[PDB]
Amino acid sequence: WIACLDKRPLERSSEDVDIIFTRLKGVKAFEKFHPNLLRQICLCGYYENLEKGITLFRQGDIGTNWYAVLAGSLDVKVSETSSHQDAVTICTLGIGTAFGESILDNTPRHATIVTRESSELLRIEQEDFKALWEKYRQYMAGLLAPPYGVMETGSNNVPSEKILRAGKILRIAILSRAPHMIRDRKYHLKTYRQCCVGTELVDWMIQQTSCVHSRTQAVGMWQVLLEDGVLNHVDQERHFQDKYLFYRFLDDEREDAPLPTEEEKKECDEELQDTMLLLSQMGPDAHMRMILRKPPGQRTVDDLEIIYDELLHIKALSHLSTTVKRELAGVLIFESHAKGGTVLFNQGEEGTSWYIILKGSVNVVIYGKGVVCTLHEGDDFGKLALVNDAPRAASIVLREDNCHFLRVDKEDFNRILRDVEANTVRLKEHDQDVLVLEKVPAQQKYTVMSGTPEKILEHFLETIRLEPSLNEATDSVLNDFVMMHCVFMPNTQLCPALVAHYHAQPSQGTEQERMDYALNNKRRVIRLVLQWAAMYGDLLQEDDVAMAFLEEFYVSVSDDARMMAAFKEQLPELEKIVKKRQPIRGSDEVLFKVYCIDHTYTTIRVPVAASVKEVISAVADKLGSGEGLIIVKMNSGGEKVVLKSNDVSVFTTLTINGRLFASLTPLPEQEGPTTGTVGTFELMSSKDLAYQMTTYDWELFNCVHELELIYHTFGRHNFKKTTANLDLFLRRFNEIQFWVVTEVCLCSQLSKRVQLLKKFIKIAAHCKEYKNLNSFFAIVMGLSNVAVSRLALTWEKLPSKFKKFYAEFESLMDPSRNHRAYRLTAAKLEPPLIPFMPLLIKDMTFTHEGNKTFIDNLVNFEKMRMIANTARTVRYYRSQPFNPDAAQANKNHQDVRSYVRQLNVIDNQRTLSQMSHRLEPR
C-alpha cells in the first residue's frame, strides 16, 4: 500500500486504489468514514513518513494540507503572545485523529504542530480537500470541527450489538453442555429464579477454552457482559465476582423463554471459540474500569496489579518510568460523562488535572478562535497542569455522549515524584551525578539505575556478600553486570580496573578496620572474577586481553597464599584448562564457496569470525584485487545488498537460499525444489516428525551462548565476535515456516493438498505437547502465509475438528497486548521448553531502540537489566535436559531424522504466490 501512496494521484490505476482501501479500512482514523468518501481519499492522498521533532506548520501560517495520523503522535502548541517561545503544549493527538481542516476557509493555522515520535501521515492538499468537502459534506459533519462540521455528534441507551450476541452464544453453549448451571436456586428463605452462580461460571469458562489461564482473567471476561447489562446480578451489583452470588442472562428475564433451536445450536458451534477470543481481548480493560471505580484508598495489592498491567498498554503513559507507573495505579481516577456538550474545564480556571481519553471525543476550544482541534480515544489534554501553576490555556467540550476519561491530579503526581526522589540515593563528584540508586523495599539493598562504568563496578564489588550461606543470592546480584559489561565497559577497561581494585588502598575506617580491608576487598575481587569467567565460560575465553589478565591474576593471588585459599583451588581450574551438534566457535576454520558473475566457484578457507576485509584478501588469492564491485548478499528474489568491511561472521547471516558474491543474477539452484514430496514425510507419523524436529531444535538451541544474544542486539561488529549459533537457530524458524508453504504450494492435487494441512496441524500439536513452541509457531506462521490462506477450496474440504485445532492455534499467535496470549501460555510451563525466539529477539531489539544506552555521559543500567532479563529467561528454559520420555527413539527412526534435518525449501514469496494462483485461480 505504501508503494501505491508513493505514486502520483493521476497515475495510480483502479486496482492500486483497491489495495490502499483495504489498508485504510482497518486504520483507526477512517473507521467512521463513508466507503465512497474513503475511496476518493485513497485516489488523491499523499503519504508522509516523518521523523521525530519535525514541525509541520506554525501558529499564524497559511495552511496548505489536511492530515490524518496513521502511525505515531504529535503535539499541539499555542502561544497567547505573538512569540513562538510562549507556546504551551495543550494536547497530544495520535492514531484515531485527523487535523488541519481550517484550510477550508483559508483560516491561518490556530497552532504549531510538531511530531513527538517517528510518525506516518496521510495528507490531502487544499484544492483536493475543498473539492472533497463539496461532494461529501453530508458525510463529513461529525468528522470535522465547526464551523466546517458540527460541535456535538450526539445531535440534541446502548446494549452493544456484539456483546448481546456474545452473551447469547455463551448461554446456548451452557444450556447444551451443562444445563445444571442455569436453574432456580434458593438461599436464606428466598428463592431466586433461572440464574447462575459466579464461581461456577468461572469454573465453566476455564474448562471450555485454552485461552483463559486464571480465575482472575475469567472475572474480567464475565465483567464485559455485566458492564453492558447482558449478564445481570440477581440484585444490582455493578461488578462481577468469583463468589457464591447469583447472576441471570438477559434473555432469561423473559418467563416464556423458548429452548434454543437446532439452527441456533449450529451457529454456537461456529462462533463460541471466536466469542471467547473477543472477550479475552475486551476483558483486561473492563477489569481495570471495575477496579478504578473503587476510590484510591480501597484498592488491594491484587487490585493495583490489575490496573498496572493495563497501564503499560496506554500509549499516553509510556513515556513515564516503571517506578512512577507502578505508583500511578493507586492514585489514578476513572471518570465518565453521559452527555455531549458538557464543559470539562474552562480557559482561565486553575489547572488541577491531566486527562487521558479512554472512550469518546472532545473539542479543544481557545477563546477568540473556536475549535482548534478534536481529540479522540488515546489522546491526552490538560498537560500543563503537571508543569506550571498557570491557568488553563483552553476549554474542553465533550464532542459525544458517554465519554470515559483517565484522570491524574497535580497534588498526587507531585507527591509521587518526590517520594521516588526521597527513595533515590545519588553519589556525586564535584556535584555531578556518578551513581544513581533506588532503594529496595521487600543491610540495605539497592537497585542500580545509572552511573559511570567505574562507579557501577565499585558498587557491585562492595555489595558482594561473602557469607557462604548467601552463595547464590550474591551470584544472582552480580549477574546483570557480568552479563552486560561488554556494552559499557569492555575487557579493555574491566581487566585493568579489576587489577587496581585488587591493589587498592582503604580510604576510610578505624586502624583495625583498615588492616582487615585488604583481605575482604581482595577476595571480593576474586568472587567477581570467578563469576565473570563463568559467564564467558569454556572455549569462549579465547579473548587475548581476558587470557592475559587471568594468567597474571593467578600470579598475583599466588604471591600471597597465606590466609585463605579455599577459593584459590577454583582458580587453577580456569587457568590450566585455558592457557549431536557442536557449538561453532569463531576460531573454527570453515570452507565456503563464493560466486562471481557467470556463476563460478571460489572455495575459501577462513575462520568463522573473519571480517569482510579478511574475506577480500583470500578472494584476491587468485591475484587481481580491486576490480569491479566486490562482495554482495544475494537474495533468492534477486535483492542485492552490499556489506561493509568491518562486518564479522557474515556466512551465517544469509537468507535460507541466499548466496555470497564477489548486473547480478542469482544461481538457478537458489529457486529451490521444482517438485513436491511424493510419499516420504506425509506418510511418516506426525508424533515421530515432531519428536525428531524437537530433538534437532534443542541441539541448535543449546549451542547458543548467552552473550550471542547480547552481540546480536547491540550490533555484531562492535564486539568483533560471532553469533553463528544464534544465526542458524533463527534460520530454522524461517526454514520450517517456508517448508510448510513450499510443500502445500507444490502439491498439485486438491485431495492430497488437504491431507498436508491435516498433517501440518497434527505436527504443530505434537510440537506444542513437547513444549517446542518455536517449531509450533513456525508451522502455524507458514500455515498463515497469504499463499496458503488464499486456498479457500483447500480449507473448505478440511474436516471440522482440524478447523477447530487451527483456530485455537491462531488465537495463541494473537499480537494483542504485546503477545499476551503467548506470554501467559509460556509462563505456566516448566523449564524444558523452546521459546518463540523471534519474539525474544524482537523484545531485546525494541528495548535497545526505545532507550539510550548513555543518558548524557552516564550508563543507563536500567536498560541493561531489561535486556538481561530476557537473556536470563533463556537460561531458565535450558536449565533442565530434554527427556525423550522413553518408548520412542530406539535406534530405528533414522528415516524421519534424516528428512527433518535436511530440508530443501523455497524462500521466494513471488514464486510461491504465483504457484498458489496457478493451483486455485483468483
Query: This structure's resolution (angstroms)?
Result: 2.7
DSSP letter at 561 equals: T
What is d(CA 63, CA 102) in angstroms, rounded to the nearest whole number? 8
710 in Cβ contact with 716 (< 8 Å): no
The maximal CA–CA distance of the chain, rounded, in angstroms, is 102
Give me the residues paired with residue 834 across strands: 772
What is d(CA 543, CA 711) in angstroms, rounded to the nearest whole number? 15
CB-hemisphere CA count at 13 Å for 247?
Answer: 29
294 in Cβ contact with 302 (< 8 Å): no
Report how far Cα 871 is from the mean position of its chain's Cα atoms: 15
129 in Cβ contact with 104 (< 8 Å): yes
- Asked if residue 393 belongs to a known ligand binding site, the reply is yes
DSSP letter at 84 equals: G
Q: What CATH number is given for 440-579 in this structure?
A: 1.20.870.10
CB atoms inside a 10 Å sphere around CB 52:
11
394 in Cβ contact with 169 (< 8 Å): no
Q: Is the dihedral of CA 833, 836, 837, 843 positive or negative?
A: negative
Strand order in the sheet with 659-661: 640-642, 632-634, 659-661
Domain with CATH 1.20.870.10 in the chain: 440-579
Single out the residue of 468, 461, 469, 458 nearest to residue 564, CA to CA.
468
Give me the residues paired with residue 76 across strands: 91, 113
Q: For helices 724-746 and 773-782, give the axis angle rounded to 10 degrees.
A: 40
DSSP letter at 611 equals: B
CB atoms inside a 10 Å sphere around CB 670:
20
Strand order in the sheet with 231-233: 183-187, 190-197, 246-249, 231-233
Report how far Cα 365 is from the mean position of its chain's Cα atoms: 37
What is d(CA 816, CA 162) in angstroms, rounded to the nearest whole number? 19
Letter string b/e over residues 386-410, b meaning 16 or more CB atoms within 10 A of that residue's CB: eeeeeebbbbbbbbbbebbbbbbbb
Single out the residue of 445, 415, 447 nearest to residue 436, CA to CA.
447
Question: Environment class of residue 327 by beta-carbon count within 10 Å: exposed (0-12), middle (13-18) or buried (19+)?
Answer: buried
DSSP letter at 646 equals: T
Single out the residue of 210, 208, 204 nearest to residue 811, CA to CA.
210
Single out the residue of 674, 590, 686, 670 nearest to residue 896, CA to CA.
686
Give me the residues paired with residue 596 across strands: 600
Length of the chain in terms of residues written: 922
Domain with CATH 1.10.10.10 in the chain: 156-260
Collapsed DSSP state (helix, strand, coil) of residue 712? helix
Collapsed DSSP state (helix, strand, coil) of residue 633? strand
What is d(CA 834, CA 768) in angstroms, rounded to the nearest whole number? 10
Q: Is 137 left (phi over 0), alpha (psi -120 to 50) or beta?
A: alpha
Give me the residues paired with residue 185 across strands: 192
State the method: X-ray
For 733, the grid coordinates are: 524458524
54 in Cβ contact with 114 (< 8 Å): yes
Report how far Cα 635 is from the mean position of its chain's Cα atoms: 27
Pairing type for strands 353-359 and 119-125 reads unpaired
399 in Cβ contact with 361 (< 8 Å): yes
First to last CA, the chain: 20
337 in Cβ contact with 361 (< 8 Å): no
What dihedral angle (degrees, nearest 10) is formed by the CA atoms of 389, 392, 393, 397? 160
What is d(CA 905, CA 908) in angstroms, rounded to the nearest whole number? 9
Q: For helices 471-488 and 453-463, give the axis angle rounded to 10 degrees.
A: 170
Query: 156-260 is classed in which CATH architecture?
Result: Orthogonal Bundle (1.10)
Single out the residue of 579, 483, 584, 610 nearest to residue 534, CA to CA.
483
Question: Environment class of residue 33 by beta-carbon count within 10 Å: exposed (0-12), middle (13-18) or buried (19+)?
Answer: buried
What is d(CA 77, CA 206) in angstroms, rounded to the nearest whole number? 49
What is d(CA 16, CA 37) in angstroms, rounded to the nearest whole number? 16
- Give residue for cell 506554525: 58
Written as one letter, the residue type at 153 is: T
Rounded alpha-carbon distances, angstroms, from residue 662 to 591, 592, 648, 815, 879: 16, 13, 16, 40, 43
Strand order in the sheet with 424-428: 424-428, 433-439, 446-451, 859-860
For 227, the grid coordinates are: 458492564
Q: Is the dihedral of CA 219, 220, 226, 227 positive or negative?
A: positive
CA R_g for the chain: 32
| Ranges of H-type helices in 254-406 | 262-292, 301-311, 322-328
Single out the residue of 614, 621, 608, 597 nearest to residue 651, CA to CA.
608
| Ranges of H-type helices in 770-908 | 773-782, 786-789, 792-797, 800-812, 816-827, 837-849, 861-877, 894-901
- Asked if residue 28 belongs to a known ligand binding site, the reply is no
621 in Cβ contact with 627 (< 8 Å): no
DSSP letter at 881 equals: -
What is d(CA 909, CA 135) in angstroms, rounded to the nearest whole number? 41
Domain with CATH 3.10.20.90 in the chain: 580-658
Single out the residue of 537, 519, 551, 554 nearest to residue 482, CA to CA.
537
For residue 385, what is the enclosing H or E element? none
What is d(CA 101, CA 22) in angstroms, rounded to the nearest whole number? 25
What is d(CA 721, CA 608) in angstroms, rounded to the nearest whole number? 9
What dihedral angle (degrees, nearest 10) is formed by the CA atoms of 785, 787, 789, 794? -130
φ, ψ of residue 557 in degrees (nearest 5)? -75, -25
What is d(CA 271, CA 171) in angstroms, rounded to the nearest whole number? 12
Single out the residue of 498, 551, 491 nearest to residue 522, CA to CA.
498
DSSP letter at 296 equals: G
What is d(CA 889, CA 886) in angstroms, rounded to the nearest whole number? 8
Q: What angle do CA 71, 75, 81 make, to 5 degrees?
A: 160
Single out the residue of 913, 882, 608 nearest to residue 788, CA to CA.
913
- Asked if residue 533 belongs to a known ligand binding site, the reply is no
Letter string b/e over residues 498-536, b meaning 16 or more CB atoms within 10 A of that residue's CB: beebbeeeeeeeeeeeeeeebeebbbbbbbbbbbbbebb
Describe the chain by its helix, strand, coil percentages, rounded to 5.
50, 15, 35
Rounded alpha-carbon distances, angstroms, from residue 182 to 176, 195, 200, 239, 295: 11, 5, 10, 20, 34
Written as one letter, the residue type at 311 is: L
Written as one letter, the residue type at 808 is: E
Domain with CATH 2.60.120.10 in the chain: 1-155, 261-439
Written as one letter, the residue type at 754 is: V
Single out the residue of 632, 642, 616 nearest to residue 665, CA to CA.
632
What is d(CA 726, CA 708) in angstroms, rounded to the nearest whole number? 7
For residue 29, what is the enclosing H or E element? none
CB-hemisphere CA count at 13 Å for 290?
Answer: 25
- Give residue for cell 458492564: 227
Contacts of 256 (CB under 8 A, 6+ apart): none
664 in Cβ contact with 671 (< 8 Å): no
Written as one letter, the residue type at 765 is: A
For 806, the grid coordinates are: 487451527
Rounded alpha-carbon distances, angstroms, from residue 438 to 13, 34, 411, 432, 641: 60, 53, 23, 17, 46
104 in Cβ contact with 133 (< 8 Å): yes
Collapsed DSSP state (helix, strand, coil) of residue 661? strand
For 276, the grid coordinates are: 471467547
Collapsed DSSP state (helix, strand, coil) of residue 514? helix
Collapsed DSSP state (helix, strand, coil) of residue 397? strand
DSSP letter at 52 equals: T
Written as one letter, the residue type at 520 is: N
Question: Environment class of residue 749 by beta-carbon count within 10 Å: exposed (0-12), middle (13-18) or buried (19+)?
Answer: exposed
Written as one letter, the residue type at 911 is: T
Residue 9, preceding peptide bond in cis (omega within 30° of 0): no
Query: 261-439 is classed in which CATH architecture?
Result: Sandwich (2.60)
Contacts of 406 (CB under 8 A, 6+ apart): 314, 332, 333, 334, 335, 355, 356, 357, 358
Question: Environment class of residue 203 by beta-carbon count within 10 Å: exposed (0-12), middle (13-18) or buried (19+)?
Answer: middle
Looking at CATH, the fold of the domain delimited by 580-658 is given as Ubiquitin-like (UB roll) (3.10.20)
Contacts of 617 (CB under 8 A, 6+ apart): none
Q: Is the dihedral of CA 113, 117, 123, 129 positive or negative?
A: negative
For 402, the grid coordinates are: 458517554
For 809, the grid coordinates are: 492455534
What is d(CA 224, CA 280) in angstroms, rounded to the nearest whole number? 10
Rounded alpha-carbon distances, angstroms, from residue 726 to 69, 570, 702: 38, 30, 10
608 in Cβ contact with 619 (< 8 Å): no
Contacts of 679 (CB under 8 A, 6+ apart): none
Single out the residue of 452, 362, 380 nearest to residue 151, CA to CA.
362
Rounded alpha-carbon distances, angstroms, from residue 130 to 125, 136, 148, 528: 9, 10, 11, 70
Give me the residues paired with residue 366 across strands: 370
- Asked if residue 478 belongs to a known ligand binding site, the reply is no
Full 3-state SS string of 726-769: HHHHHHHHHHHHHHHHHHHHHCCCHHHHHHHHHHHHHHHHHHHH
What dihedral angle (degrees, nearest 10) is formed by the CA atoms of 313, 310, 871, 214? -140
What is d(CA 383, CA 750) in angstroms, rounded to the nearest whole number? 61
867 in Cβ contact with 808 (< 8 Å): no
What is d(CA 109, CA 86) in angstroms, rounded to the nearest whole number? 16
Tell me the residue ranges of DSSP E strands in 130-189: 183-187
273 in Cβ contact with 811 (< 8 Å): yes
Give me the residues paired with residue 595 across strands: 661
The verdict on domain 659-922 having CATH code 3.40.50.970 is no
For 676, the grid coordinates are: 513436491
Written as one letter, the residue type at 393 is: A
Superfamily for the 1-155 domain: Jelly Rolls (2.60.120.10)
Rounded alpha-carbon distances, angstroms, from residue 117 to 200, 312, 395: 47, 18, 26
Collapsed DSSP state (helix, strand, coil) of residue 77? strand
Domain with CATH 1.10.840.10 in the chain: 659-922
Single out the residue of 183, 203, 163 nearest to residue 252, CA to CA.
183
396 in Cβ contact with 381 (< 8 Å): yes
